[PDB]
Amino acid sequence: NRPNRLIVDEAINEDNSVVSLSQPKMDELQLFRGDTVLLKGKKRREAVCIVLSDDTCSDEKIRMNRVVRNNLRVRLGDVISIQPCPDVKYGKRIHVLPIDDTVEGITGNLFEVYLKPYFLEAYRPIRKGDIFLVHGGMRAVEFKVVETDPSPYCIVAPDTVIHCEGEPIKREDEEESLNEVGYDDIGGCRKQLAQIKEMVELPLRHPALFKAIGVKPPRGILLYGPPGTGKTLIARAV
Amino acid sequence: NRPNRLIVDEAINEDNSVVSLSQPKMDELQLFRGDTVLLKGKKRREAVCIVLSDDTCSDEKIRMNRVVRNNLRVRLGDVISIQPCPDVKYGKRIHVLPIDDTVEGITGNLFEVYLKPYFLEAYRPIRKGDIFLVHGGMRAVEFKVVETDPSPYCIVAPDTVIHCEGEPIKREDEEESLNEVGYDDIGGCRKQLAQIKEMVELPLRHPALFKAIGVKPPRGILLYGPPGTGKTLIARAVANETGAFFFLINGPEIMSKLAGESESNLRKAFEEAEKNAPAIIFIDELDAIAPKREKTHGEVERRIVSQLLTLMDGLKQRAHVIVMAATNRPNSIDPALRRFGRFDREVDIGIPDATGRLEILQIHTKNMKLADDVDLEQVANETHGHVGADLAALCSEAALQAIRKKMDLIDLEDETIDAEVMNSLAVTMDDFRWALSQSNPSALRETVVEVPQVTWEDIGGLEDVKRELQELVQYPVEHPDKFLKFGMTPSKGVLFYGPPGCGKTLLAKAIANECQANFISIKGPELLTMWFGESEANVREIFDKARQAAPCVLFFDELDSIAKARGGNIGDGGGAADRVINQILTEMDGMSTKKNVFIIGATNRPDIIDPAILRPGRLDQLIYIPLPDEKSRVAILKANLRKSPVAKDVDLEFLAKMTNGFSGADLTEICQRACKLAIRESIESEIVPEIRRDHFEEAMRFARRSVSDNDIRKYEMFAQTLQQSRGFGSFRFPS
Numbered sequence: 009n010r011p012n013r014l015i016v017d018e019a020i021n022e023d024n025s026v027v028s029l030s031q032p033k034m035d036e037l038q039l040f041r042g043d044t045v046l047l048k049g050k051k052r053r054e055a056v057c058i059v060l061s062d063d064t065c066s067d068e069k070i071r072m073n074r075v076v077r078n079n080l081r082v083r084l085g086d087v088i089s090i091q092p093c094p095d096v097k098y099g100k101r102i103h104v105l106p107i108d109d110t111v112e113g114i115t116g117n118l119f120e121v122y123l124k125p126y127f128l129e130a131y132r133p134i135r136k137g138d139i140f141l142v143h144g145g146m147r148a149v150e151f152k153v154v155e156t157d158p159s160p161y162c163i164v165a166p167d168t169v170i171h172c173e174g175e176p177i178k179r180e181d182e183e184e185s186l187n188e189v190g191y192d193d194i195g196g197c198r199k200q201l202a203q204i205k206e207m208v209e210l211p212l213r214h215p216a217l218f219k220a221i222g223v224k225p226p227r228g229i230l231l232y233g234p235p236g237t238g239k240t241l242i243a244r245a246v
Numbered sequence: 247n248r249p250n251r252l253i254v255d256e257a258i259n260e261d262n263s264v265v266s267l268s269q270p271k272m273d274e275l276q277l278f279r280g281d282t283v284l285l286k287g288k289k290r291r292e293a294v295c296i297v298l299s300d301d302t303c304s305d306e307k308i309r310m311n312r313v314v315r316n317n318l319r320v321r322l323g324d325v326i327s328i329q330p331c332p333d334v335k336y337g338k339r340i341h342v343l344p345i346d347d348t349v350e351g352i353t354g355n356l357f358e359v360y361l362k363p364y365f366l367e368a369y370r371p372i373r374k375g376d377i378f379l380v381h382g383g384m385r386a387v388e389f390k391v392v393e394t395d396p397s398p399y400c401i402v403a404p405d406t407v408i409h410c411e412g413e414p415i416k417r418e419d420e421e422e423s424l425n426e427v428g429y430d431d432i433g434g435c436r437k438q439l440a441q442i443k444e445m446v447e448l449p450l451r452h453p454a455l456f457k458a459i460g461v462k463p464p465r466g467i468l469l470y471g472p473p474g475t476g477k478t479l480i481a482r483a484v485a486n487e488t489g490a491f492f493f494l495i496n497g498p499e500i501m502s503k504l505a506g507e508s509e510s511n512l513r514k515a516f517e518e519a520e521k522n523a524p525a526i527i528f529i530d531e532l533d534a535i536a537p538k539r540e541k542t543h544g545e546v547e548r549r550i551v552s553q554l555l556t557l558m559d560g561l562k563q564r565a566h567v568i569v570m571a572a573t574n575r576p577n578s579i580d581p582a583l584r585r586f587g588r589f590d591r592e593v594d595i596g597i598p599d600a601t602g603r604l605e606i607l608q609i610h611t612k613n614m615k616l617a618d619d620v621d622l623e624q625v626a627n628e629t630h631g632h633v634g635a636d637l638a639a640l641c642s643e644a645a646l647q648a649i650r651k652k653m654d655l656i657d658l659e660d661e662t663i664d665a666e667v668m669n670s671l672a673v674t675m676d677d678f679r680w681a682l683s684q685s686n687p688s689a690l691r692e693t694v695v696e697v698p699q700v701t702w703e704d705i706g707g708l709e710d711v712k713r714e715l716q717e718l719v720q721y722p723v724e725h726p727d728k729f730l731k732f733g734m735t736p737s738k739g740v741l742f743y744g745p746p747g748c749g750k751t752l753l754a755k756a757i758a759n760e761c762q763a764n765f766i767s768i769k770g771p772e773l774l775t776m777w778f779g780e781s782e783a784n785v786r787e788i789f790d791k792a793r794q795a796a797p798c799v800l801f802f803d804e805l806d807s808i809a810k811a812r813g814g815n816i817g818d819g820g821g822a823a824d825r826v827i828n829q830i831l832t833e834m835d836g837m838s839t840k841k842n843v844f845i846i847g848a849t850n851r852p853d854i855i856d857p858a859i860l861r862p863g864r865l866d867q868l869i870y871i872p873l874p875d876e877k878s879r880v881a882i883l884k885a886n887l888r889k890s891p892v893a894k895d896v897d898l899e900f901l902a903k904m905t906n907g908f909s910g911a912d913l914t915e916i917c918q919r920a921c922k923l924a925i926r927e928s929i930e931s932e933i934v935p936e937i938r939r940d941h942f943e944e945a946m947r948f949a950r951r952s953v954s955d956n957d958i959r960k961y962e963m964f965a966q967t968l969q970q971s972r973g974f975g976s977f978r979f980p981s
């Protein structure tokens with residue numbers, strides 16, 4: 009039954025694209041702690057991330073971050089596959105090209121003071137066609153590379169060089185705007201959101217499953233709380 | 247007169263097509279017990295079934311199941327014929343061909359894991375063209391064979407073979423879709439449905455009989471009960487299985503559209519039903535249609551109310567139609583609709599008790615198979631305030647939790663789903679507990695109208711009052727002629743007083759079970775809720791709901807509890823009467839004694855009750871219950887110790903005789919403390935399921951004595967004063 013599938017769950021870390029797995033998984037696929045791992049998703053695309061050991065989260069699940077959520081076009085409550093990749097990668101050059109969808113009202117050089125302090129002391133592999141969010145300047149902007157060295161063989165190291173052009177590309181409808189609200193954009197209410205996770209994920213991700221059985225799904229959910237509690241944002245995110 | 251006709255009645259079994267007959271029928275047509283019987287119906291078709299002996303159902307009737315109901319095209323309240331067929335039948339091959347009407351979203355092989363475990367160990371004859379329902383895979387699907395060996399000669403045996411093709415046929419209009427609601431699809435209410443059976447079956451199945459006689463059939467039936475009780479489903483079932491057209495308009499579909507055509511839609515709804523005679527009309531929501539009590543707003547609202555009143559006032563004989571209406575409370579309906587010829591007949595549906603909720607459990611969970619350690623009897627006991635729809639929602643939600651704990655680790659991401667794994671989704675104990683804890687009941691504060699579950703064995707001792715209560719309320723009901731011959735009327739109510747904590751509710755509850763009647767509960771806090779609310783209209787229908795569910799008994803607890811908040815013997819400048827004392831007796835003064843109803847008054851202090859209540863004619867029977875004796879406390883304690891395990895060295899005669907000023911509650915709290923302290927030792931020793939003698943001496947330490955010596959003399963002097971049998975206690979008449 010291809011024993012490599014993993015359920016998709018929201019992570020708890022507030023760092024960059026770092027996944028969390030359980031302790032038997034480390035020895036199941038002969039990985040070490042600090043190694044580069046490759047993930048395979050849908051739409052025939054790959055991804056790179058870093059494994060992190062955890063024994064408190066669960067027994068059999070993964071905790072995958074918001075960056076590679078939209079990078080791999082994988083939503084919550086789906087299937088995913090993972091595999092090791094013990095290959096030495098030494099990046100040499102990168103192409104920088106933001107999209108004008110969110111880069112508005114900002115001029116000057118935003119590549120030598122904004123992306124520089126974020127890449128050092130991270131040692132995070134990058135892939136051709138990644139979508140990650142970074143902070144700085146009272147706002148946030150994503151990143152996307154369209155033409156670079158063929159992935160794999162990309163590792164953040166000081167010897168790598170950078171070069172900018174200054175002509176943003178037009179976005180397409182193939183991907184989703186990460187600036188929208190996600191599941192990790194709601195805080196302060198953990199017990200209330202878990203009820204929605206087990207109330208809405210089934211009828212939406214499995215339409216034929218409920219269309220084939222006699223179980224009647226709920227047709228209405230009432231949201232309570234004082235005005236401003238975040239009722240609109242929960243509905244927008246789910 | 248062809249002595250072979252049989253009336254059609256709904257069966258009680260939950261098995262496949264098995265009929266039930268009476269004991270003389272077995273020898274009338276020379277049948278044995280385990281034989282194949284043939285039934286002949288209308289439309290020139292035959293049927294096969296199995297006879298089952300029964301002596302409890304009736305004297306002359308049949309109890310025929312839901313499968314052959316629709317298989318033989320025979321509805322309830324019709325004629326039928328039966329005949330033996332002692333012919334040896336040995337089937338050899340069967341053709342399987344489902345209809346795509348309900349087989350949707352299901353793929354794979356559904357003939358080797360679904361029909362296989364259902365046919366074995368059944369030995370049920372089958373016929374060419376049968377329609378039967380089977381369960382499995384969180385859903386149900388019927389079956390129909392179109393071409394096979396010529397019936398008869400079809401018996402389920404292991405030597406038979408099967409073969410499938412995989413091309414469903416298109417259904418026709420000759421038969422009826424069995425997936426709809428039937429009469430056996432309603433549970434938890436048996437006494438309420440029997441009234442409809444004798445109210446709707448006559449004008450619908452016999453149109454010419456009423457058209458030829460001068461009897462005026464009812465033109466409107468009002469349905470009561472909290473929302474979700476099943477009012478819509480009862481109306482849907484009583485119309486789909488009578489060959490009568492059913493038209494449904496709920497409550498807001500009228501007000502949703504623009505003003506001007508809403509009345510036209512209502513008018514044409516009545517006109518279209520007359521053409522399809524016989525027909526029926528059901529209104530799901532009507533309290534939102536005619537709120538003519540406190541609304542007094544909207545020009546078109548009264549126009550719609552008057553249009554409905556005109557449409558039903560004008561319902562002459564012409565054709566056959568019955569108008570049904572459903573609501574939540576009797577006080578939320580326009581009184582102009584309650585006039586004669588519109589809604590003269592009313593029926594109330596209450597929340598089912600344990601024996602009703604048990605049935606509503608399987609009537610919904612039949613489509614999913616359970617485990618060998620999962621039972622519905624114990625889970626239906628904790629729930630008391632759940633509406634009939636609450637239980638169905640709980641089952642559906644528990645199914646989701648049962649499937650969620652495995653669907654995560656299965657991770658079967660595919661477009662279609664097979665039926666080989668949807669059937670293996672069994673539910674366990676861990677899912678009902680979570681579902682029942684997370685559920686939110688709807689009717690928790692409605693009037694508690696249920697059948698108790700306590701008998702005379704639960705109450706120890708008190709043999710003096712048992713005979714008095716046995717000779718007072720059962721004699722007028724069992725022997726009505728004797729009371730009428732003498733010319734006097736039976737008593738209407740019994741009020742008793744005594745020290746608190748003597749089971750004043752237990753004898754009132756037990757008297758209802760042995761007399762096979764309903765029971766209502768109006769406790770003290772329930773009686774203090776309108777002393778402040780300034781709403782005297784709520785005490786109005788508590789008697790109506792009791793008299794509608796005849797026979798019934800009315801119970802009043804701590805009847806003087808209102809006087810405590812107002813004082814007592816002196817209190818304020820007033821006396822011993824208020825806005826609620828004058829409402830208790832005014833309503834029961836004008837009631838008919840002939841009705842099978844009873845009023846029970848329980849109180850602790852009889853010196854505070856106003857003498858107006860105790861007047862001869864309303865509450866004249868006074869019974870004083872003293873402290874239990876030594877020989878009665880043994881039975882009282884062993885009644886409570888029945889559920890918990892009891893060791894062999896536990897002596898109860900000595901334990902009961904060492905209490906003198908202890909009432910009934912003092913013994914129950916001692917047992918509760920002992921059995922609670924037993925759990926502490928069991929948990930502490932874990933880091934045994936039997937109680938011992940060591941848990942007693944540590945439990946009687948917390949023995950409380952609520953009934954002090956000041957109240958005993960106060961009650962005795964009142965009882966002796968109210969009894970007064972001195973001076974002429976023993977006298978012989980001369981002649």
Ligand SMILES: Nc1ncnc2c1ncn2[C@@H]1O[C@H](COP(=O)(O)OP(=O)(O)O)[C@@H](O)[C@H]1O
Nearest residue numbers: 193194195196197234235236237238239240241
């Ligand atoms: N629990 C929360 N988590 C994250 N953001 C919140 C939360 N509650 C409020 N907010 C922020 O404040 C605003 C809440 O408004 P919103 O919830 O949409 O209206 P309402 O409170 O009426 O539902 C949003 O802009 C949201 O970003």
Ligand SMILES: Nc1ncnc2c1ncn2[C@@H]1O[C@H](COP(=O)(O)OP(=O)(O)O)[C@@H](O)[C@H]1O
Nearest residue numbers: 431432433473474475476477478479634635638
């Ligand atoms: N007594 C009952 N027997 C069987 N099913 C019931 C019963 N009560 C409720 N249900 C189920 O719950 C639902 C309750 O809806 P319904 O009773 O039609 O609305 P209302 O409660 O307003 O009459 C029904 O559709 C039925 O499936």
Ligand SMILES: Nc1ncnc2c1ncn2[C@@H]1O[C@H](COP(=O)(O)OP(=O)(O)O)[C@@H](O)[C@H]1O
Nearest residue numbers: 704705706746747748749750751752882910911
């Ligand atoms: N004869 C008896 N048999 C069984 N239980 C009794 C008896 N007398 C008193 N009790 C217990 O006393 C408890 C109090 O019952 P209750 O009806 O509240 O008394 P009261 O009439 O004072 O309200 C009951 O739970 C019952 O088990």
